[PDB]
Amino acid sequence: QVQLVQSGAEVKKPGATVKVSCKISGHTLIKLSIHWVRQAPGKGLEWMGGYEGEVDEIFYAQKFQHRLTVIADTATDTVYMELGRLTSDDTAVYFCGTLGVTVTEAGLGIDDYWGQGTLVTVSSASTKGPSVFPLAPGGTAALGCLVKDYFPEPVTVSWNSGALTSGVHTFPAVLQSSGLYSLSSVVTVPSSSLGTQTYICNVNHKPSNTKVDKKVEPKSCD
Amino acid sequence: EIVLTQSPGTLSLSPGERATLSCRASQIVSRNHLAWYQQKPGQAPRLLIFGASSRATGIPVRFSGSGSGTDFTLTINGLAPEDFAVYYCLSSDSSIFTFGPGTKVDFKRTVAAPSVFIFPPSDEQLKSGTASVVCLLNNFYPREAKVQWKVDNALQSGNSQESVTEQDSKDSTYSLSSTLTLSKADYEKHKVYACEVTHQGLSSPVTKSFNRGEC
């Protein structure tokens, strides 16, 4: 019944400041270790700093301490991280987690509670919904949808309103030199189904309220 | 400061096999402050081992750790399907924490060459002034693959991006896309668009290509 709940996704311009919260229920901050750990897309875990409730002390990674403040509110069981002078290097998922060990004569104590993560995107880009373009199709054919030029993450894709799942690969997005994201979603299907079965990709970019259903039709030389 | 390294970068093993993951510290660290975490895509990390060798509550008995000084290991004695994930060691001194770079444990299946498909830009996209050409490498193993773009035999460098799926939970393969971006003007000034794929499963590289304008 212990729960750590973080605040929602953030989009910030370079040079701005972000503040992320981590709220504890089912437990008390004064009995907990709460540390901030971030993860850039496709990269490893990086400790930023944290709070030890027993000693009421804050700790910082030297890499960040000039622009990072950690705030503990023992009255509301909430811990905050405030990171300034943001750049695109700070785009990452930020987690709060109970990293600290208590060393007593009776042994080692540790909790393992984690928040759900908070995505922070640092960019000059403006919110923009994607354009969806067809990737038109032996015994197996491939087809797909190109979901191009959107900001920020995330985007979801289904096929035939969720009825088509086997053989689908929706790729992780790439960040283009324009600062806009792009991804493709593909599916392999029987080539004998191309004249019969309709294939529609359902694309949802909630940050821009953009929903698109794109029918993908085969190419023929006949 | 403590600095942690981990080896191997990627460990490819089959279910039932014994995985040994290594963590090395730049200086002697307290055994009380050496831990191991598992992480799967889209999820927070999960504690496996603390104090170098103590198993966390609810962690299966096949996970163990040992070591002292600068050298520590995590052992998964008989991999289960749910164990394919990334593993991080973690150390601290005076509540200053440092994560190792992580070791990915992926599922070792038989080598499978990719099926390769090339997609020309749609006419709809071309009307906007840009052309994306997509090359798909489908359902291959292992993950390492090389894609080369050629436009009328000119090697394209710096104008493509790749993406790779996570290892499939049913057939343990990977898939990869490579997307070549050109202006509409450049696209219409050239004819042959080719994606050349190299992979250990392929005895020779596979080229998929189209002639602009062909059906």
Residue numbers in the entry:
A (entry chain H): 1 to 52, 52A, 53 to 82, 82A, 82B, 82C, 83 to 100, 100A, ...
B (entry chain L): 1 to 27, 27A, 28 to 214
Could you give the paper's own sentences about this structure?
To investigate the conformation of site Ø and define the epitope on prefusion RSV F recognized by AM22, we determined the crystal structure of the AM22 Fab alone and in complex with the prefusion-stabilized RSV F variant DS-Cav1. Crystals of the AM22 Fab alone diffracted X-rays to 1.7 Å and crystals of the prefusion RSV F–AM22 complex diffracted X-rays to 3.5 Å. The AM22 variable domain (Fv) superimposes very well between the bound and unbound crystal structures, with high structural similarity across the framework and complementarity-determining regions (CDRs) resulting in an r.m.s.d. of ~0.31 Å for 214 Cα atoms. The AM22 antigen-binding fragment (Fab) has an ~50-fold higher affinity for subtype A with an equilibrium dissociation constant (KD) of 0.12 nM, whereas its affinity for subtype B is 6.1 nM.
